[PDB]
Symmetry: C2
């Protein structure tokens, strides 16, 4: 049937997964990377146009900010060979030098690719995305580039971080949340306003191609 063109995913449950396997939380994030690799390849083959993914303590953040570097070295080449285009959204200026540079190389490597767009939401917050959009628009109105009569929902959409996606694919058709949490977490509040929501108890590192197909199957049974 109809495959949803844009899927949002809140990758929850890496810590619980690792605890369940009696391993450090760091092992869970590593397995979370594997799950993303599997899901990204499967969705690309099934014909999904976009996946926007969202990751959810002192020494943990050091290991977590090294994951984009690890992503670039051990996963990005295979994704690039699968014709996957890699982008990021969020306040990426806050990220460390090594992290921003690994992600930039992944963007540059894959920028000509014509398959699925893998969109990393990093240092991302919905309200903050909207806030900065409403700031830039107000600056442009103060500088007379745009009129206050030109302020519309379409204009706001052009100033969000999802602006770089193709116009018809900016808004998720489906938002998947793992690990049993029935809540929003400030992920794509604007873009996801009309999205089908799907909730599963399965933990993110166990979310595989079969779990993706079950989510896509649930989406088709809606309408």
């Amino acid at each position: 049937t109809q495959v949803p063109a844009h899927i949002g995913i809140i990758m929850d449950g890496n810590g619980r997964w690792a605890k369940k396997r009696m391993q450090p939380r760091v092992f869970g994030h590593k397995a979370g990377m594997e799950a993303l690799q599997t899901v990204t390849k499967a969705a690309n083959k099934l014909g999904v146009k976009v996946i926007t993914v969202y990751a959810f303590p002192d020494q943990e953040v050091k290991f977590i900010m090294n994951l984009p570097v690890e992503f670039y070295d051990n996963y990005v080449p295979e994704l690039h060979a699968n014709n996957v285009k890699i982008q990021m959204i969020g306040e990426t200026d806050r990220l460390p030098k090594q992290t921003f540079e690994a992600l930039t190389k992944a963007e540059e490597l894959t920028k000509n690719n014509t398959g699925l767009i893998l969109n990393f939401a990093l240092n991302y917050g919905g309200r903050a995305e909207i806030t900065q959009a409403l700031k830039l628009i107000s600056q442009d109105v103060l500088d007379a580039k745009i009129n206050p009569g030109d302020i519309t929902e379409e204009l706001i959409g052009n100033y969000l971080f999802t602006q770089h996606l193709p116009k018809d694919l900016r808004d998720p058709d489906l938002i998947i949340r793992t690990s049993g949490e029935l809540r929003l977490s400030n992920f794509l509040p604007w873009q996801g306003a009309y999205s089908e929501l799907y909730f599963t108890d399965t933990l993110w590192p166990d979310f595989d191609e079969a779990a993706l197909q079950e989510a896509i199957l649930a989406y088709n049974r809606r309408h």
Copy 2:
């Protein structure tokens, strides 16, 4: 352990009426009874705010949503006033009919001093539209030099949304309920609900009562 602000998407009125071989109008009158029951019960339990959204031949659906506050004023608001419930509307007023605008304002003016539960009606409401209208007002205040673009923060935007009239600690729903089995938010409080707990039930809105409200509050407490 009661959530202070509960959002409610009231869906399933049409399905409820068609199941009983009755006209669609019958379903919406039963929907107003459900709202009365839920409003009274929530007020009793100590809920501070409920924001309600009537959502579901689109020309037919618009007539029922706009007829709501006229009938609600005549048949239900007096009892809510006696129960110390404050009534407020969020959404766009400019495009309302005359009889509807008068019925909403009479309901507001009647109940404006009440110190119990705030019943917040979302009528002619859209989240994206609300945020867009907030920008228009912020943009105009930047041109008038009342504020700088640098002053535009998350807290400022909150003061320009339709929920600004609620107290600052109660503006955002802690829980959002949707009836009729649909797993969507349908453009309801996208900003304000960004961190809300969600509760979905297959129950149709006219069957949603005090008991269903308490089952929802129970589920909310199991999250903590």
